[PDB]
Design a binder for this molecule. Structure first.
Ligand SMILES: Nc1ncnc2c1ncn2[C@@H]1O[C@H](COP(=O)(O)OP(=O)(O)O)[C@@H](O)[C@H]1O
Ligand SMILES: Nc1ncnc2c1ncn2[C@@H]1O[C@H](COP(=O)(O)OP(=O)(O)O)[C@@H](O)[C@H]1O
Ligand SMILES: Nc1ncnc2c1ncn2[C@@H]1O[C@H](COP(=O)(O)OP(=O)(O)O)[C@@H](O)[C@H]1O
Ligand SMILES: Nc1ncnc2c1ncn2[C@@H]1O[C@H](COP(=O)(O)OP(=O)(O)O)[C@@H](O)[C@H]1O
Ligand SMILES: Nc1ncnc2c1ncn2[C@@H]1O[C@H](COP(=O)(O)OP(=O)(O)O)[C@@H](O)[C@H]1O
Ligand SMILES: Nc1ncnc2c1ncn2[C@@H]1O[C@H](COP(=O)(O)OP(=O)(O)O)[C@@H](O)[C@H]1O
Lengths: 152, 155, 151, 151, 151, 155
């Protein structure tokens, strides 16, 4: 899908509490990606168990689920060329200690457990996460007036 | 309400020009830095139907058809913000309807030029806010959460 | 008049909300010279004196208690008309009346949590500077930018 | 009226204080179209004509000599009501009178060091644009954002 | 080496996306000295010469046509190691390879729409500056901040 | 420490060039936004004496006299910041000693050019931080306060 690739991103409860939602959104807007879905939600533990199913045998899994369910999150879908991989570069390493300055985690976070944002790790993960969090009628198609200036 | 006033809510929407011009984050950050509490948020493609109801007071103005068509022309970011005097204060942060009359420091004063592409809507009154919130959101979309910042914004 | 000085303090809410740097940057960008700075926990006794003119007001006790409740950033800034200009940058006491573009207009909601204190007059500034700082904390420096800020 | 143009110039103090980008960004973020730009040093002869309406004012000589003393960034911006709106963005002549949120309100202290010039009227802009720029320095370009700025 | 100079150009996509001021501010905040600036539309003849090292590359033709298609902001910046450092601030040619914090890493997606050109070497810079600018367009000014940037 | 590590402290100082160039607020804002806790702060005119001891280790370097003279050539903003891995992290945020080697996104990478005017000092190690904090601050200048934000920065 090339420039139509999509990723799932979510601002975690700490990002909402720390008033960093606009800052995060602005970084993806300024990069050139197209916002195609957005909502403030409180995720159920049932949903979050499915979301993090790959991690279910890790010792932190339970508290990760409980935490992500504990307050509002901002769920998003962004669209563009290589948006999955590039979003992960913008976000930075899982452990903010390893995330360089200039990344979101590098600039704003200290600890792995309070690392502001989730982004899909692969196109296949993105497909699964988008379907989990969003209905199809929440995913918008619009003609981007900037696209001529971002793409060949 | 009247208890303390702090649970007043307004409807704000980033119009299609705000999305196209990549100002969503900038607009949200201004309300975040002010101290208001985001209690609802969604990106939507608004139907002409809903918009006719939203702008019903402008039903017999000459621009009405172009406004509705335009607001339906692309995504809108619909929001509800909560806090003391949020309706009046949000109108001040946005600035005058005609950007030419909105001072620098306001959203319209800083970011736009013409009345027909003026980035954002905010409820003009508490009663308008009640009506607009109900029109645009379901009850279950309005979130109750515990704002760690409140202690530092409110006496 | 370029050596006029004012006393500004970031109140405990400004520290807690991580707005210290934002506030300092606004006075830097305006052209004023920072000549004193410290993070302190003010005593209630100091604060009772600082706000003595308000001692008969219903809110005086809670103002004092609050200002003593957490760290504040005490500052002295220097430049032409700095006292009045700083008050303009800060905005009205009640943030509801502070326009966008001002510190209180951009960042605050309520009169009791209004981020920052600034002296209200040159004589108030002299008094407040003396209350909060020793003479050896007030620095003198030659501003490389001054030729570009003053005629 | 969307093709109205104004002449703006970053004065020597704006260049020296490293505020050129900040100023340009304010006009870009507003939605105006940059149609001419150059870093130049103007002659006193050009400046005497630029400010010819102020020839009887006691500061005229000083103003001319100062504006000739260092580089300035000359610009033309295009858009609806650009002259009047640009003046609003810049703020009052005397920065003491310019509210926070304006360029002069945010960055300046004194009337002689007030960062930027903007034309005062459509007819003054026509005159100033002609004075500072060759016709071939004003560029026509198709504005991708035009549909989202204008109805 | 503090008098080294580089040629930078904001490409048509940077103008259209309203990123001129953002880009300039990044070089200003670094401490580099702006010594020439203009908004221009370059000829294919000039651009063929500009990019002559790339003449056997498959994209050469489309690169030349594109850079000729709309306005660019041509600039010269001065300072110690300005060529190499500017390239670092810009980031990798392909924005997919440019880290966050760089211009291309922060603002761009694709190699053909990568916002800005910067000279690749001191000798390339000398050639490019000569190609785009007349000698009288390069300004000598006394930098008020130089004592605080350099030893 | 070793309980959780969250009470580690570093000494940071904005050098005179950072004061003159009006980057104090910019610098402080980068540490605030990262989540570290400001526990001490003062503007000082550092004596040639204090500085000779600060930079004792560099006594045999040919630039030593010029470093001490420069660090006394205007005000310095002395700070103590607290948090998990604050010494190592602060060094990463500042970037390499030589700004030409500091990547964009770091303080030195974004804001300065030459090694002799490199804006800021941060402790290079936990032991150095212990020594620097002791040298520049009195114990009663290091404040214990309840950080509302810690709940959102720490698990
Ligand atoms: N060792 C850990 N302890 C606590 N939380 C962790 C740990 N490792 C990962 N996590 C949390 O689980 C989330 C999902 O892990 P993972 O998908 O591997 O990382 P990423 O979010 O960088 O793609 C992380 O973002 C983080 O919040
Ligand atoms: N004279 C006008 N010409 C064109 N569009 C207008 C005009 N007046 C209002 N509008 C449009 O209709 C919207 C609703 O108008 P109104 O409620 O009066 O303003 P506001 O949005 O400031 O509350 C405006 O925000 C603008 O988009
Ligand atoms: N009505 C009030 N209720 C609570 N606190 C108040 C009230 N009026 C003033 N204050 C507090 O007292 C501080 C000092 O008041 P004053 O000197 O009159 O205002 P300012 O700080 O704007 O100069 C204010 O900044 C505010 O924090
Ligand atoms: N009283 C004054 N003293 C010194 N310089 C002045 C004075 N009044 C105006 N100037 C300078 O002359 C410039 C041109 O004046 P004017 O056109 O009246 O103001 P503006 O630039 O706001 O349109 C001003 O921008 C300012 O630099
Ligand atoms: N494979 C490519 N496809 C399209 N355009 C390209 C490609 N490689 C390079 N370019 C364009 O050519 C310009 C000049 O290339 P080069 O000098 O090698 O890179 P840089 O601009 O990073 O110094 C690039 O900035 C880019 O816009
Ligand atoms: N080669 C040099 N020439 C001049 N000044 C230098 C040189 N190396 C270091 N300095 C200065 O001495 C300070 C201390 O050096 P060092 O401890 O090696 O760096 P850092 O401050 O990054 O820990 C530097 O921050 C810089 O101001």
């Amino acid at each position: 899908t090339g420039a139509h690739e999509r990723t799932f991103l979510a601002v975690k409860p700490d990002g909402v509490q720390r008033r960093l939602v606009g800052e995060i959104v602005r970084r993806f807007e300024r990069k050139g990606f197209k916002l195609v879905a957005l909502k403030l939600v409180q995720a159920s533990e049932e949903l979050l168990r499915e979301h993090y199913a790959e991690l279910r045998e890790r010792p932190f899994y339970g508290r990760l689920v409980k935490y992500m369910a504990s307050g509002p999150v901002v769920a998003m879908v962004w669209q563009g060329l290589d948006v999955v991989r590039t979003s992960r570069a913008l976000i930075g390493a899982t452990n903010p200690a390893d995330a360089p300055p200039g990344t979101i985690r590098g600039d704003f976070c200290i600890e792995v457990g309070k690392n502001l944002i989730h982004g899909s790790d692969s196109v296949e993960s993105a497909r699964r996460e988008i379907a989990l969090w969003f209905r199809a009628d929440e995913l918008l198609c619009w003609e981007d007036s900037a696209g001529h200036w971002l793409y060949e």
